[PDB]
Inverse folding.
């Protein structure tokens, strides 16, 4: 029944809606009816929100904070919004996305964060909105997002990343997300794209846009080339021989990959009696090879005790044991090559 | 006609939740046994359950993805039925949760990554596993099991159970999954699409030095840029070595052209220029020798002496050859003496003189030797 | 002459190179240096280099709108002696160093809207003093080199639609008679200086100052007496006026407060040449201005032999043997001039 | 008719470039002298030059803004001409550049700031200057010189700070007030300052008064207490806190009307002073904060009842604060051994039983409160 001054709140059965768009507000209205259901604070000038603002608003199903000067959000301020379905935080000055923000938003289906200055998104910050349908993170400064939380969003259909600086993207994503119908990743810093059956459905139901990206046109992107999509002015960046030319203007036979080659490995080493033994093995190629090591029989552990692994191509066994001598062999995984060399220790 | 007979019956598999489990079933007979899968006497209906017909049409594969528990913990039966008869066999399914995983369960140490091989070439899908006991490796192309029974094109490697596919073709394109299985249970690995392209036909030419490292002679503590250029297809990675030690960290290695920037050369030594591609390794040597100042020559000795002339003789006093010598004399220097002997003429009768000898090479002028009276 | 994927047409008398919406990742390597118009709008260039716009002397109009530019090489916009219009809107620029716009005398149009500008170094505009338009809307700016702006007589349009500007000097817009439009919406302005250009906004000149935390005192009474149209302006302080519209408040409610000295030093005995610190502070709306007087004059500011103004503290450094006399603390204010006295020995 | 006679002639002033220079000229006669400004026998034409007619119409003021050099370095003349006659006087203008400023040139130490005073009230435009020699202060309202000739009652220049005290302000006082300093070296103008005059605000002026005085408190050692002090009135007073010599609150953060001091770790008893101050005087108030300490020794125990094997003790509390219980110490007459204590006495009387026949005893009483145990009182023999 009670709506703040300068606000036009209308009552319709059975839900109360409070409209406060374009009112020149400097901060959130102090006395908004807590049993409201729709709240429009769009096109105002609010700088920051407090817990007391949206404290007891349980019946709220739609909140609109579009086009403001919001720079900071109180932790646990979006709490008690159990029935909130749509949230609009577009066009603001948000910097970070902490877990305390969107905690308790189970029924949230629409989450909009476009046209902001997002730099970092803390992990598990999306582990409560796992049942949303739309996520707009376009026009930001993001490079990485909590992908693990995204994979748990089966009901997702629209993911917007129109303008960012995203480094790369995991391969295991879009597995359970069968509901995906639109994905835009234009204007980012993506080097490659993982193969997915949803992308096979984009030939002439699903509409994707990947233009304006520093594509690494190798054999790892051949699947997308065979895909006969319409030209969206995509452009390659590497190899240098393909730099500049359109992604669709390049024949399928020119998307080549290179088999690895081990440059240098340790010839022999004498670190018995348990002294620290450091082994060296490295290989190069396009794309970058994957170095794995073998014992006389079997392969060792990754990032754990008794073994050092992956990048650097260097085995460090910390304090070695007295008897670890045998036959060790270095390999290099690649979409087109499997180069290898051997090294003995005593 | 002949009633259906099971040539291979499905076995009790223990999969994990969130993963994938597939059951195989095929039989023979006249006419061909049309296989239908049933649960509690009811045909499968859920979306997560899918049946894949064999190429033969004599069998079918039931794929379950994803696995859940205890929602999917039940007993299933495979019914192969035709016009003449109908047969069926049952099997048990155990779905362990992530917090129910026993100690020693199969673990994918290395899953299959994306690979691309040209037509009529060797393809090698890799995989590895661990656990108690040691699980064996089975492959699944396009949700169907790969026939690697005996050495027939596609062979499983003896122990690292890779999938060596010799003579690749169009039909080889698909999704290759890796599966490990022991007495504890069954675990699937991450899928990996394999694509086959046309023959590229690139000229493979071993590494060859286009511009070999030229020899150099530098003064002590003198910096020098030695250049080494190699060409060929594919382009070789050119590096530099001091025989035992290397300069570049091998992380940043140029293609075709490598310029070594040396500094403060104190002692003569050999630098090795090595270029390496996938077609072998070649080597080359760059000569860096330090030229130094001449050592003071041997003390000049008066062999002959007259009234107005005095002859000088001396040793080179240098291991390296000396261009010419400079004789100092006073009661003035004589430049341009190409030999180790010189007669100083135009002197006064009955006069004592002092003689010094200086050596000069390509670098410059050395010190003066100890004098001699006469 | 013209790079691939680019449609450069030659029309009398100026050469124009069009490369809009081409998915470019960096500046085309072989653009004709004797070009006059260059459109690189709606692309995806990340950074500019000196070799890009090195010898483009005949360039009069450059358009780099809607890109992903985050860094530009210093002295890359050099040699653009005939450049009149520059469009750098919708990008990811962070800072404005002096090396950027150095040598752009003939620049009339400078557009920097929709960016992430945090800092603008001084004297960065001391070469574009003859521009006609400056768009700095939609940024993170709080202060700009006003000194450089005052030397822009030919200025008519200054856009600041969305920023975080603290305050604005009073001496500006003096010689800038050509000003016809100034927008300062959505900022953090506390007050506005009185200027004859604002008197010309009654019902030629169009200003917008909505969405600002206005401090509705008597210092803004001049703007209230100005019978402009309601642009949804809202006051923030004093708390008694917080929330209500700027135009819904009568002129008689815009009040200021006379200063009051809270605490002052009673007496002081500063022999042995030690530092003599006196304390005097006053409060009011708006904040008073503390000045000190000698027996008949006032001292120097922020220079030798005297410490002054803020903190409200006279520090005479190493005091002399004879500085005793009559010193008095004052507090300037639009409505009050309270004062008290303190002696030293 | 009467030929024009100069009532005020323009003088040679030396201004600085980028600044402002104004020349004054007015004369009388029949008919009224129409004054025109000329340069090299030519009337002014440039936009930067503007002529302002006096209210009388008997004179005009030539204002040059801004000043430049040597574009404006020239000789100007003022011509006052009517029907009966025509007169003229010449004057020189010197515009020094920024690199020509001499040591001792007029400098605005403090210019006039924006001020707003209600109608029929005193207005005070402030200004200050320095240099060699000491420059005098002249004001310029609406590009016109301010008539501060003698003490009339309306507009006065102050002298012992040449301020512009305008008593009984009115509508006509609204305008732009400029400050001007001038000596033998030259002339410098100051920053403009708009003056606005509003209606009288009928507000009741009431001195500061404590609405809620600081109530006394008694807190245990090392505790905490919220002491509140509230003052009201128009104008509202700024309330602070002092411990007599020292102040707690920073002079930047002083609350209005209500000040609550949040104390912590109270170690010693002391008085805190609550001071509220407005423009109508300064008032004070005292808050009593006392620390409760160990109990004082009770009244000397007196033998009220006495038997062979029992003795009843009675005593006074000897304390302003309530006592929890008492502890009776007891030992034989000449016993040089430590006392024996009877704990758990909730009353002011207790009967010590179990004594020896023909034996004198010594009894002491100790008080114990919430804090702890105090000293023992003087004993009693029997
Ligand atoms: C660095 O490069 C040099 C080539 O330019 C090599 O210089 C050689 O050193 C050798 C001695 O180590 C010399 O070999 C001798 O040659 C004579 C006939 O010339 C023989 O009778 C000797 O048996 C033989 N002695 C040995 C021990 O081989 C070479 O004369 C000399 N060659 C030149 C052109 O100078 C250096 O060998 C080489 N150093 C390394 C570590 O590789
Ligand atoms: C485990 O291996 C990974 C590399 O795969 C390392 O993870 C990195 O950790 C830092 C934070 O400490 C991140 O900023 C990097 O982005 C991670 N790198 C990658 C490729 O993800 C990690 O350093 C390893 N941990 C140990 C103990 O070796
Ligand atoms: C990659 O390379 C460098 C050496 O080239 C590693 O530096 C070593 O780090 C370990 C500690 O983790 C030290 O004990 C060694 O002393 C370091 N080696 C040297 C030569 O300084 C670096 O840690 C390596 N990083 C990874 C992920 O392997
Ligand atoms: C190797 O070659 C380079 C040029 O090819 C030499 O360049 C020097 O360093 C910089 C270039 O980055 C120039 O500004 C200097 O003027 C160059 N110095 C000289 C003497 O040419 C470089 O000298 C060479 N390096 C060595 C060790 O000789
Ligand atoms: C811009 O034009 C000038 C000359 O028109 C270029 O300067 C010449 O550059 C070449 C080498 O690139 C030299 O051989 C000439 O000696 C230079 N001439 C002069 C007068 O310096 C200049 O290189 C051009 N700008 C760029 C970035 O290439
Ligand atoms: C706090 O205020 C009270 C009230 O004045 C003080 O009590 C007085 O103390 C003096 C001696 O200190 C006595 O001579 C007076 O008779 C007392 N007057 C009253 C009314 O009690 C008290 O001493 C003050 N305490 C402190 C720490 O300043
Ligand atoms: C919210 O609801 C609770 C009732 O449990 C009430 O105590 C509290 O005061 C309310 N807060 C606000 C800001 O209305
Ligand atoms: C004077 O000095 C202080 C620091 O000593 C400085 O922060 C301040 O900006 C200066 N103020 C003026 C008016 O010069
Ligand atoms: C200004 O006031 C602060 C009090 O916090 C003091 O620390 C500082 O020394 C003062 N500055 C000067 C120059 O005295
Ligand atoms: C007293 O001050 C403390 C400070 O923490 C606060 O928690 C408490 O609520 C206050 N109590 C009252 C009555 O103001």
């Amino acid at each position: 029944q009670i709506c703040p001054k300068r606000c036009v709140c209308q009552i319709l059965s059975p839900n109360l809606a409070t409209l406060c768009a374009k009112k020149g507000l400097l901060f959130v209205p102090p006395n908004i009816d807590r049993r409201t259901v729709e709240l429009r604070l769009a096109d105002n000038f609010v700088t920051n929100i407090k817990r007391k603002d949206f404290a007891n608003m349980t019946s709220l199903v739609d909140l609109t904070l579009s086009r403001n000067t919001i720079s900071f959000i109180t932790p646990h301020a979006f709490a008690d919004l159990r029935n909130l379905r749509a949230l609009h935080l577009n066009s603001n000055r948000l910097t970070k996305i902490t877990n305390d923000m969107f905690s308790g938003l189970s029924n949230l289906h629409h989450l909009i964060l476009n046209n902001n200055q997002l730099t970092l998104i803390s992990s598990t910050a999306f582990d409560d909105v796992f049942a949303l349908e739309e996520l707009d993170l376009s026009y930001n400064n993001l490079e990485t997002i909590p992908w693990d939380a995204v994979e748990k969003m089966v009901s997702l259909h629209t993911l917007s990343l129109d303008h960012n600086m995203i480094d790369n993207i995991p391969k295991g994503t879009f597995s359970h997300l069968h509901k995906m119908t639109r994905l835009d990743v234009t204007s980012n810093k993506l080097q490659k794209l993982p193969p997915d059956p949803l992308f096979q459905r984009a030939q002439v139901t699903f509409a994707l846009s990947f233009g304006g990206n520093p594509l690494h046109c190798n054999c790892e992107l051949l699947w997308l080339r065979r895909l006969s999509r319409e030209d969206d002015l995509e452009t390659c960046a590497s190899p240098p021989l393909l730099t500049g030319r359109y992604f669709w203007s390049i024949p399928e036979e020119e998307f080549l990959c290179e088999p690895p080659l081990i440059t240098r490995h340790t010839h022999e080493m004498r670190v018995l009696e348990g002294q620290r033994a450091t082994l060296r093995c490295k290989a190069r190629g396009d794309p970058e090879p994957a170095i794995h090591w073998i014992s006389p029989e079997g392969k060792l552990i990754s990032n754990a005790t008794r073994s050092l692994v992956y990048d650097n191509g260097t085995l460090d066994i910390l304090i070695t044991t007295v008897k670890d001598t045998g036959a060790f062999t270095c390999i290099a995984s690649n979409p087109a090559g499997e180069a290898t060399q051997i090294v003995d220790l005593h | 006609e002949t009633p259906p007979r099971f040539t291979r019956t499905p076995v009790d598999q223990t999969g994990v939740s969130g993963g994938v489990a597939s059951f195989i079933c095929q039989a023979t007979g006249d006419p061909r046994p049309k296989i239908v899968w049933n649960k509690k006497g009811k045909k499968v209906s859920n979306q997560r359950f899918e049946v894949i017909e064999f190429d033969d049409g004599s069998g079918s594969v039931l794929r379950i993805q994803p696995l859940r528990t205890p929602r999917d913990e039940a007993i299933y039966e495979c019914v192969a039925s035709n016009n003449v008869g109908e047969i069926s066999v049952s099997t048990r399914l155990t779905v362990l949760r992530e917090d129910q995983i026993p100690r020693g369960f199969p673990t994918i140490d290395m899953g299959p990554q994306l690979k691309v091989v040209e037509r009529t070439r060797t393809a090698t899908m890799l995989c590895a596993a661990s656990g108690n006991p040691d699980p064996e490796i089975t492959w699944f192309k396009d949700f169907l099991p790969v026939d690697t029974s005996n050495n027939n094109r596609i062979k499983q490697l003896r122990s690292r159970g890779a999938l060596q596919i010799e003579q690749s073709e169009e039909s080889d394109q698909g999704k290759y999954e890796c599966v490990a299985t022991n007495s504890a249970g069954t675990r699937y690995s991450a899928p990996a699409n394999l694509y086959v392209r046309e023959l590229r036909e690139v000229r493979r030419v071993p590494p060859r030095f286009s511009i070999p490292p030229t020899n150099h002679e530098i003064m002590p503590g003198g910096s020098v840029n030695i250049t080494c250029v190699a060409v060929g297809s594919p382009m070789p990675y050119v590096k530099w070595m001091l025989g035992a030690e290397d300069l570049t960290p091998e992380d940043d290695m140029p293609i075709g052209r490598n310029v070594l920037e040396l500094n403060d050369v104190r002692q003569s030594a050999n630098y090795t220029c090595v270029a390496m591609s996938t077609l072998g390794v070649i080597e080359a040597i760059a000569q860096i020798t330090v030229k130094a100042l001449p050592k003071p020559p041997g003390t000049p000795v008066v062999t002959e002496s007259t009234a107005t002339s005095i002859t000088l003789t001396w040793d080179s006093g240098n291991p390296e050859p000396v261009s010419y010598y400079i004789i100092q004399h006073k009661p003035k220097e004589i430049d341009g003496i190409a030999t180790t002997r010189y007669s100083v003429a135009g002197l006064s009768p009955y006069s004592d003189y002092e003689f010094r000898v200086v050596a000069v090479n390509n670098i410059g002028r050395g010190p003066a030797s100890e004098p001699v009276l006469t």
Summary: Helices of chain C lie at 146-149, 221-225. Residues 221-225 of chain C form the longest helix (5 residues). The radius of gyration of chain C is 27 Å.
